[PDB]
RNA sequence: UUGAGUGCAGAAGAGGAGAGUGGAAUUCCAUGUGUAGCGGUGAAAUGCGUAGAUAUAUGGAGGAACACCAGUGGCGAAGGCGGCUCUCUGGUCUGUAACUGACGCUGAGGCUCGAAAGCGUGGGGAGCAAACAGGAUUAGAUACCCUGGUAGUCCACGCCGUAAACGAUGAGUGCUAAGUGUUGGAGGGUUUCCGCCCUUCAGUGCUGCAGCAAACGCAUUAAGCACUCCGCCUGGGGAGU
């Protein structure tokens, strides 16, 4: 009943495109389950790779706590 | 007991000074089913009180008991199964009683080899917060607070 | 002296003590306080109450060299870290902004065995 | 040409080996502040500390495991595999129906793989911890509890070949009511369907009918109905001696 995220026919998530990616971290930094967000199957994978190459090259923070 | 609380049968008031606690303390010194005597006692110490210093024989009795009424109590609760002793809000009543209590039992030990004399230099040392059951209420005020740190959130 | 009146402080409390000092934002150590010095003992000082005397025998103190507000750093999963802010708070105290940092590793320790009793 | 296999078109995956790389955390080290405790227990003690401890801030070092995503999810023949990126590399599934024409199944001896502990040779060593030491409880405690700590745990190449190595359920193949979720697909209608509905292939869980079972229960992922090939058993001890 919650609807996908890819309703807009998106394809590639190129790892970069940093407004599109926001959507599904936590607002201190962490990862947000399907369940939560109401994600697809293949969809939930990709996703996390491309926020751990994002998480490597400083294009998002590891801790925003402080 | 174990069901619930139970009644607490209340008594007269004094046929001199028409007291509740006059009648209440003079229970407390009867022993063995024989009365008059007792008010005997406690008639004569009343007037040997208002001999010297003359106030009265209640106002002074009552600034006694304010004296040695207490307001905490080591009450003894295995929560944690161990010899943990809480401090505890004590009741209003039990307050009376256990002054009554010290009172009387602690001036039984005074020794003036008369009847009653015993009693009246007691309650008139004790308004006067000399004597130790002064000194008990203190030593119990003492003891509570003395661990109120790990056993007051129960 | 110096009259700082900017720093902040810090908590941490395990499961059988408790701690909390005052410092600067840098923070050169100020003022500091702890169960184990205001004579409590062992078994109690893990206390919701020993929390109290801590914070206030702290700040009664560094308050003094000049300070208004302060931050609050709060470790030690325990039982004093609800009852020391407050306590901080009614003494006269500023505490404004509050973080829990406690650390979490990200899997690269091997904690000890289990106990059995 | 139906079983098997190959071609052509697509799909998923913590399947494996090699080469580098990231952050958080614990610890040791350097320095600033800083004053008398820290840590531990059912209670205590041993212990570290006024040669300045715990705390706290900055930077450095080193080894190890990969927080959240994480799911009765995925892959592998089993043991098992979870940080990221690259080079080499195996297997499975759905579609089509080009092609060979039964090329199949099982499989004693043989060969290969094979958790953890263990051995050898050379490295490496942060945490944790058999042995060991000290402290406690106990009539006694060479144990449970606490403070330390050596081999080991990691890396390369060899060795050993064992687990309740479990679903205590050998492998191939075909037939016999349903309902319900979930991973990966291919088709058909509605269609913005990429959000529904219908048909089908492959795994993967729960309930349940015939039938079976000494009961407990199992039931298209049979422990039902049947054929083929293998392994094993025949009272409990003596003893896997």
Redesign the interface.
């Given at each position: 009943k919650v609807d996908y995220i890819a309703a807009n026919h998106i394809e590639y998530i190129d790892y970069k495109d940093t407004e599109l990616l926001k959507r599904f971290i936590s607002e201190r930094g962490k990862i947000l389950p399907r369940r939560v967000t109401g994600t697809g199957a293949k969809n939930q994978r990709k996703l996390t790779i491309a926020i751990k190459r994002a998480r490597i090259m400083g294009l998002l923070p590891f801790v925003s706590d402080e | 007991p174990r069901k619930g609380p139970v009644a607490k049968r209340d008594v007269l008031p004094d046929p001199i000074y028409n007291s509740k606690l006059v009648t209440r303390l003079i229970n407390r010194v009867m022993v063995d089913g024989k009365r008059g005597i007792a008010a005997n006692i406690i008639y004569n110490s009343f007037d040997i009180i208002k001999e010297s210093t003359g106030n009265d024989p209640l106002e002074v009795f009552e600034q006694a008991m304010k004296n040695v009424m207490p307001v905490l109590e080591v009450k003894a609760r295995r929560v944690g199964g161990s010899n943990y002793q809480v401090p505890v809000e004590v009741r209003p009543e039990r307050r009376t009683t256990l002054g009554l209590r010290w009172v009387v039992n602690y001036a039984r030990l005074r020794g003036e080899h008369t009847m009653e004399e015993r009693l009246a230099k007691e309650i008139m040392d004790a308004a006067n917060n000399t004597g130790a059951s002064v000194k008990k209420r203190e030593d119990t005020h003492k003891m509570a607070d003395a661990n109120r740190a790990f056993a007051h959130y129960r | 002296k110096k009259n700082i009146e900017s720093g902040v402080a810090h908590i941490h409390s395990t499961f059988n003590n408790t701690i909390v000092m005052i410092t600067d934002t840098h923070g050169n150590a100020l003022a500091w306080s702890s169960a184990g010095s205001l004579g409590?003992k062992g078994?109690?000082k893990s206390?919701?109450?020993?929390a109290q005397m801590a914070a206030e025998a702290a700040t009664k103190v560094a308050m003094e060299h000049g300070l208004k507000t302060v931050d609050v750093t709060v470790k030690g999963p325990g039982s004093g870290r609800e009852a020391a802010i407050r306590s901080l708070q009614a003494t006269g105290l500023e505490v404004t902004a509050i973080?829990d940092?406690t650390p979490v590793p990200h899997n690269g320790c091997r904690p000890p065995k289990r106990r059995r009793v």
């Open positions: - | - | 409590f078994s109690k206390t919701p109450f020993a973080r940092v």
